[PDB]
């Protein structure tokens, strides 16, 4: 339907999934996008715009690779189904739908198939907010410099080796 504000946001870390609540007030957000985009670059200002609801770590390297493969193909794994099932408010008679920022439009239909009351959003504001999570990384998570990068190293090797049959 008509443009509804983004309420939640999904970010796929190499170490697990994160669901954030979007706190940014989005009245006439188009007239303020440049100002919001500048806020996103500063960690302190960004904390006004989003807040972590839940981070669900993968159990280990094998599950991480399964999820890297599922996400690369726009699929909803059992781990992604779980974090969305547990941390997105359920539809009710007083609040009928929930909006979720995702960066990959092709993941949307897979999410909606599991959660028909979720409307996925991948517009410029969604992309800007996701960039902000990508930028500020570990500072957003209770439990360090390198943690995510170390995990990307192992996961990138695992993903690539599976492709080339190593």
């Amino acid at each position: 339907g008509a443009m509804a504000p983004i309420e939640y946001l999904l970010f796929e870390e190499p170490t697990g999934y994160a669901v954030f609540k979007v706190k940014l007030q989005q009245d006439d957000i188009g007239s303020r996008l440049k100002e919001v985009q500048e806020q996103i670059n500063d960690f302190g200002a960004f904390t006004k715009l989003i807040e972590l609801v839940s981070f669900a770590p993968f159990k280990g390297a094998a599950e991480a690779l399964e999820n890297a493969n599922d996400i690369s193909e726009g699929l909803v794994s059992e781990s992604l189904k779980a974090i969305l099932d547990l941390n997105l408010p359920k539809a009710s008679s007083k609040k009928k739908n929930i909006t979720l920022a995702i960066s990959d439009k092709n993941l949307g239909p897979s999410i909606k198939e599991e959660f028909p009351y979720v409307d996925c959003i991948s517009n410029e504001l969604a992309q800007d907010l996701i960039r902000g999570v990508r930028l500020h990384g570990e500072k957003l998570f209770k439990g360090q410099s390198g943690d995510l990068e170390r995990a990307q190293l192992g996961l990138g090797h695992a993903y690539s080796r599976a492709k080339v049959k190593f």
Partner: protein, 231 residues
């Protein structure tokens, strides 16, 4: 042999019989693709090994030899390298960014990609990504935000590839360093059109250099990503 610092941090000049462009080897004793290694002495004297960076064999080295003012690749930087091939140029980018930096090295073809993975095993600051750079959502779990996107893709649709990857991963005010081989896309008209496509993706051109005498009809372009739009 005497080592002199290049204008660009992480790059050096080895002064001897010949003056050679070199990087400091992150995997001492290991050559990646047959390039010469030079050990310089500086309790036994300490030895530091450098690797020759031949501008005839690497588009980025050719650009550096032409006198790029801003490289955006430097110690500690995170670099998204599109068109990583077997890892020859990537190995030098890895030397430049050092232990505090990271090179995300994207290559679609499996024959070179297998060699890229193999060489990356010896360099923990390289993340090898064997995937199609036209579909950056596919590897978003593997990449953070980067300070520079370098592209040596030689594809007709490389402008869109560069754009999609910059919008997902390139910091605001980050750099774009692109090799443009007109033949794989007159040369001056092609260069101008590709640079215009960059402008349309919020990338402000800063410098444009020929790669002569190292390459024919190639042009390296440096730009700055303006996330909120060109000012």
């Amino acid at each position: 042999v005497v080592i002199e610092p290049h204008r660009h941090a992480g790059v050096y000049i080895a002064r001897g019989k010949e003056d050679l462009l070199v990087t400091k080897n992150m995997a001492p004793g290991e050559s990646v693709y047959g390039e010469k290694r030079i050990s310089v002495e500086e309790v036994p004297p300490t030895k530091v090994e450098y690797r020759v960076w031949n501008p005839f064999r690497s588009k980025l080295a050719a650009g550096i030899m032409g006198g790029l003012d801003e490289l955006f690749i430097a110690p500690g930087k995170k670099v998204l390298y599109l068109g990583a091939a077997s890892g020859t140029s990537v190995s030098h980018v890895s030397d430049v960014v050092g232990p505090e930096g990271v090179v995300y090295a994207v290559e679609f073809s499996h024959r070179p990609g297998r060699e890229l993975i193999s060489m990356a095993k010896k360099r923990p600051n390289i993340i090898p990504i064997i995937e199609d750079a036209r579909h950056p959502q596919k590897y978003r779990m593997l990449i953070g935000m980067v300070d520079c996107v370098f592209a040596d893709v030689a594809q007709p649709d490389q402008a869109r590839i560069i754009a999609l990857n910059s919008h997902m991963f390139l910091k605001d005010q980050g750099g774009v360093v692109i090799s443009i081989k007109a033949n794989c896309i007159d040369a001056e008209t092609v260069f101008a059109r590709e640079v215009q496509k960059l402008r349309e993706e919020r990338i402000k051109p800063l410098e444009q250099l020929t790669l002569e005498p190292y390459e024919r009809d190639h042009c390296i372009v440096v730009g700055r990503y303006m996330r909120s739009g060109l000012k």
